[PDB]
Amino acid sequence: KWVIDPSELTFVQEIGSGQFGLVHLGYWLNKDKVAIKTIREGAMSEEDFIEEAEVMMKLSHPKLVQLYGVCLEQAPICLVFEFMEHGCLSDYLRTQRGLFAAETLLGMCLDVCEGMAYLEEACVIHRDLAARNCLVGENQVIKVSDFGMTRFVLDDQYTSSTGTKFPVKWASPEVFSFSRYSSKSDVWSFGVLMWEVFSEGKIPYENRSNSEVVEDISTGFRLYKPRLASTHVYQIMNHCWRERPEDRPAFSRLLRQLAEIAES
Numbered sequence: 373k374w375v376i377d378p379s380e381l382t383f384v385q386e387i388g389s390g391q392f393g394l395v396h397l398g399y400w401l402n403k404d405k406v407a408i409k410t411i412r413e414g415a416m417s418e419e420d421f422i423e424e425a426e427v428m429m430k431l432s433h434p435k436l437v438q439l440y441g442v443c444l445e446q447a448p449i450c451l452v453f454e455f456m457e458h459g460c461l462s463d464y465l466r467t468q469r470g471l472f473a474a475e476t477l478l479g480m481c482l483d484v485c486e487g488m489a490y491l492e493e494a495c496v497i498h499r500d501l502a503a504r505n506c507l508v509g510e511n512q513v514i515k516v517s518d519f520g521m522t523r524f525v526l527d528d529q530y531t532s533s534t535g536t537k538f539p540v541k542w543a544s545p546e547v548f549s550f551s552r553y554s555s556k557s558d559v560w561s562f563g564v565l566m567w568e569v570f571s572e573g574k575i576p577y578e579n580r581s582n583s584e585v586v587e588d589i590s591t592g593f594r595l596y597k598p599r600l601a602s603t604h605v606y607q608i609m610n611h612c613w614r615e616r617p618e619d620r621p622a623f624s625r626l627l628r629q630l631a632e633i634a635e636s
């Protein structure tokens with residue numbers, strides 16, 4: 373089943389917090405360690421999420437964070453996930469800055485690409501792919517998390533392309549203009565995630581307002597090459613940022629290209 377009773381969970385340590393609610397490390401009965409995300413009232417369209425949870429849980433891949441179930445008996449609801457020991461990739465990059473080999477950084481991009489090629493084949497669009505939405509686990513494996521979750525967020529300032537909080541830094545032009553999501557808009561976001569990885573967690577378009585990012589991208593500006601990215605890796609990042617979605621590589625193509633670079 374996909375419904376987890378409240379008696380099947382324990383809450384050991386709070387590990388995260390934000391406007392969504394809280395995250396705890398806990399245990400799940402007869403099924404080991406978990407991260408439990410408690411959702412604040414009004415943050416999410418809970419009925420829409422609960423309607424799709426069972427189908428969402430069948431998206432299972434070694435490079436995707438597994439959703440194990442939903443505790444919905446009483447408010448607030450909890451979502452129960454696979455526990456990732458090193459936390460979000462954005463913070464992991466920042467705290468370990470200066471300690472990465474370029475091969476490790478490319479390997480993190482490959483893990484994300486592998487999870488995204490699975491979602492692309494399943495015709496599942498992430499919509500908000502970024503280093504903050506990737507988690508680091510056993511042996512520094514990266515896994516993609518929160519795919520499709522912006523479909524349930526109730527904060528219009530974050531979900532509307534004209535919203536004050538919209539994540540325009542990772543959005544392709546057709547997303548920041550029209551909310552035209554596709555696997556090719558996720559590819560643009562993946563180019564920005566690659567830039568976050570090779571820069572060791574710098575924030576893209578630092579200090580630029582949302583309208584300034586739109587004006588810059590529309591006028592051909594692109595993120596500068598990080599020092600640790602080779603010319604060839606930066607070439608692939610620029611292919612992710614092609615203005616037309618049709619000219620961007622699919623994740624299946626990126627996965628072969630990046631693997632050839634890593635394995636050579």
Ligand SMILES: Cc1cc2[nH]c(-c3n[nH]c4c3C[C@@H]3C[C@]3(C)C4)nc2cc1N(C)C(=O)[C@H](C)N1CCOCC1
Nearest residue numbers: 387388395397407409437453454455456457458459517
């Ligand atoms: C800060 C933090 C947040 C973490 N968030 C998650 C996490 N795992 N899975 C999900 C999520 C987050 C989100 C619920 C998901 C969709 C899925 N892992 C996390 C690990 C840490 N790190 C680096 C720690 O040092 C914490 C304090 N430690 C780790 C060792 O064990 C003891 C506690």
